[PDB]
Structure formats: structure tokens, C-alpha cells
Structure 1
Amino acid sequence: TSALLAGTITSGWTFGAGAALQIPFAMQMAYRFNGIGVTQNVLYENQKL
């Protein structure tokens, strides 16, 4: 589970579809909002929240 968690935090979701490709967690949460229909500007206006 630690190998699957470190790929989720550091590499996003690209580690299961191939090699581990890193992406920041600020960019990871912004791009998973686009999957559910949320514009990514909501995240950075409330990143401390």
C-alpha cells in the first residue's frame, strides 16, 4: 500500500497506466477537479482552506 500511495501522491494517476510520471499535488487536485466537472480555479483560490 505504501508503493501505491507514493505513486498516488507524487505521480498522480499515471503510475498505473505505465511508468511513474510525477506531477505536483497542487496540479493533481486541480486536474481531478476537471474529471468531476469542477473548474480548477476553485482549488487555488481556497488552497489554504
Structure 2
Amino acid sequence: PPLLTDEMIAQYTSALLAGTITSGWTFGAGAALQIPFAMQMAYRFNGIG
């Protein structure tokens, strides 16, 4: 049997998705920082020029 059950993998994916919605990309380089979603989309639009 595999070491990691599917429940743990689901928990990992849920954590990643919640982090990337509620904090943008800042949670992958330190501590999570909250920011409204519209402003995050504006930042990404600036990113694509």
C-alpha cells in the first residue's frame, strides 16, 4: 500500500488551492499575506502586460 492515503493528498491540494486564492503568490516565498481577489487579478494583468 502507498505511504500517503488519498485523504492526505486531498488535504494537501485543498491547502494549496486555499492558499493560492486567499494570498496570491506570496505564500510560496514566506508567510501568507491576504489580498482581495480583484487586486490580485489586476496584478496578474499587469504581469501579462
Q: Same fold (TM over 0.5)?
A: yes
RMSD (CA atoms)? 0.6
SS in 1 for 2:26: coil
**How many equivalent residue pairs?**
37
Displaced runs of 4+ in structure 1, greater than 6 A? Answer: none
The structure with the largest alpha-carbon Rg is 2
Structure 1: gaps of 5 or more residues? 38-49
Q: Which of 18, 21, 41 is equivalent to 1:6?
A: 18
Query: What TM-score do you get using the length of structure 1 for normalisation?
Result: 0.71
Distance 1:7 1:27 in 2: 16
Structure 2: gaps of 5 or more residues? 1-12
- Taking only the aligned residue pairs, the percentage that are identical comes to 100
Quick one: which amino acid aligns to residue 14 of structure 2?
Answer: S
More helix by share: 2
SS in 2 for 1:18: coil
- 1:18-38 CA deviation, whole Å, 9 max, x = no partner? 10011110111000011110x
